Ligand binder design. Structure first.
Ligand SMILES: Oc1nc2ccccc2s1
Ligand SMILES: Oc1nc2ccccc2s1
Ligand SMILES: Oc1nc2ccccc2s1
Lengths: 281, 281, 281
């Protein structure tokens, strides 16, 4: 199924008829960082399998729901179960839910992810406000926009220089300062590793040379589809490790260690994003 | 349809029966740089849709013609409507028209494109003679030659060190000097960005570190197919901007600005390539 | 055909019924480096075309056999005819033979390849023990593990930091010292060029900047599938040239020159790997 105007419209019509919520904020939460979704008020849960033209996610399994409701007095839609390109989903499958958000009325998209640290100032448990990216799949002919352009949504050749809204980064930092955890908050450039293997020790050393501050396997495809259709983005990485130190010391990362860092910072991140939603202009 | 000997032969036979031109020069023109094709003499226009085994281009739309005729006393074939890999065309679709050129008798292929400037000496409106390239799709398993080798055309493992003919670069510079616009003419290394998004500000900074002088979304696939089958190449970039300055100043590029630079330099480039064709050995 | 547990099990059952060998060592030999396979003792040759679920290799042609038998008193299985991703084989086709090795009992995989030299200390005829890699296809969304995870074989997110066993590198060096050819033996980082074009002169210069010591078109896909399912790896490159010198001098490489270096070093490499097999713990 192509992520075109007709197919996205049929999905949006179903959601409007089931939900009665017109959201203007969308959220996509990283591994182990979804507790906020469980606290949406006056909420409606819509399994992906029931939405016309949504991608099939049964081979992967696990949760796959759209959740609509209220947070801090604002109307929102959340993806509960994020789609990743290392699972084998196509460009069209990644893009369709973001384009449905657009048709539903979403103007701001808030994103979190788990990432490895490259910059020497970063350690386990830190947060990085993403200010730009290096898209290795895009340079190498696997950009999420390869294919015919869907002109109803945006232009053939997008400019990404303002993909990460500056005012939203400033608001996120302001709230950290107001609650005295600003010493955890950095800014940086995100390298997109297609995955699913963690970057090797020698790949980590290369990324340091290239000006990358963090590395992850998500986020950039959704950012590009959002920017193409005029949705503002805030993206925040939770740092699980420092991959440069691990390479120097012959120490390794694994998914169990990553999830343990997520559980340590989950409550703080939930509170932070609730206040961001509340305070959005 | 595979870009094999039998399929290319059926296309070449049709063209010979309609055209009565046996060209030894081929040309592929960049965005907004095709006025020379409109001035081919004693010309025959053959829409792609009518040529056996040519790729289907109706989803994209717009012009798609082969044009054969005479320029400066030489017999030529031009692609009017260039195929780009960011549109979703396969390796086989990109390669078949170049292999048809080979079977028709083409020995030299002349190419122009629009590109972003990386080297600090480059500004809007400059020309770059391409002397080498960095093929990010090729390193990343999206080379135009991935698949079975078509042995009738060339070897399994090509050497690209002479892909950009040195004598043709010298002739192009000589003509610029003869007509006193050599101050516009540089040489440089071309980075292939698969596209369709313009390189991000942080990608631009990375490309500077890696020794790239310009960045574009075309040209390298056709160069590789030509080199594989023994066709000499001259490739010239028209610089639309300097992406490093734009990143430092938080300024952006877009397709409207690119086309405006093309219109400013179109007449000069048309005259330059007419004389190159005339003077080819 | 997917490289899943059921499909690999049907292949392994056929091999066990034809062969009566339960190997614990697997070998994959590089271009022109397969003489050791011709000397396996008490051997059984099984053409790929006869093995359930093995990939079809007739479009490429040439030899394609599994060979089981004894070397130095050890039970081994060899791939005679290696699959390369530049030929167009999918992730699943590359992975299935390695996963069959796992089910047959293989615990150690020995690999050779032909490669270009990047490090200035490397010259034609040298050997490089591979200690790490830079996987350009993997960073760019063409990792061999893209797709659903086959949980029976390994984890969704593998760690590659110990992919190249340290003790096996030390044993290989010890044997070189015992037979006085240690002056040929280096260690280094392997860059995976998807291919099939040799790295261009400007790509070679980029690879030097990024910390690469050698460049090749094979090996990394098999290493990743082996590491995912717990098989130890030793990988050795035979250096055909120095690509940085060739770029500075405007000199070229080709497949004929590569095979001539392989023939010069074939006998020594055969003896080295026979002793490694004999001495494995
Ligand atoms: O490509 C990625 N490297 C890392 C390291 C830590 C955590 C998450 C990710 S995702
Ligand atoms: O990848 C590309 N960057 C640029 C900038 C300007 C113009 C054209 C192109 S194509
Ligand atoms: O990507 C590759 N470059 C080279 C050079 C020499 C030999 C073999 C290979 S494979």
């Amino acid at each position: 199924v192509v992520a075109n105007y007709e197919n996205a419209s049929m999905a949006a019509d179903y959601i409007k008829r089931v939900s009665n919520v017109l959201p203007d904020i969308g959220i996509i939460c990283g591994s182990g960082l979804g507790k906020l979704i469980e606290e949406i008020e006056e909420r409606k849960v819509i399994p992906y399998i029931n939405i016309p033209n949504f991608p099939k996610t049964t081979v992967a399994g696990h949760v796959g729901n759209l959740v609509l409701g209220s947070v801090g007095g604002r109307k929102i839609v959340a993806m509960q179960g994020r789609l990743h390109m290392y699972e084998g989903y196509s460009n069209q499958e990644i893009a369709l839910p973001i384009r449905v958000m657009k048709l539903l009325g979403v103007r701001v998209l808030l994103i979190t992810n788990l990432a490895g640290g490259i910059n020497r100032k970063l350690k386990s448990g830190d947060f990085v406000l993403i200010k730009g990216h290096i898209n290795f799949p895009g340079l190498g002919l696997n950009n999420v926009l390869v294919g015919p352009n869907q002109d109803e949504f945006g232009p053939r050749f997008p400019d990404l220089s303002n993909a990460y809204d500056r005012l939203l980064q400033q608001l996120a930092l302001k709230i950290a300062q107001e609650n005295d955890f600003q010493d955890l908050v950095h800014e940086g450039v995100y390298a997109f590793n297609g995955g699913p293997t963690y970057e090797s020790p020698d790949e980590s050393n290369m990324l340091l040379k290239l000006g990358c501050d963090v590395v992850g396997m998500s986020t950039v495809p959704e950012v590009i589809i959002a920017c193409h259709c005029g949705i503002k983005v805030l993206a925040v990485s939770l740092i699980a490790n420092n991959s440069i130190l691990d390479a120097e010391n012959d120490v390794s990362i694994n998914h169990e260690k990553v999830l343990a860092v997520a559980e340590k910072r989950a409550d703080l991140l939930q509170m932070w994003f609730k206040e961001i939603i509340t305070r959005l202009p």
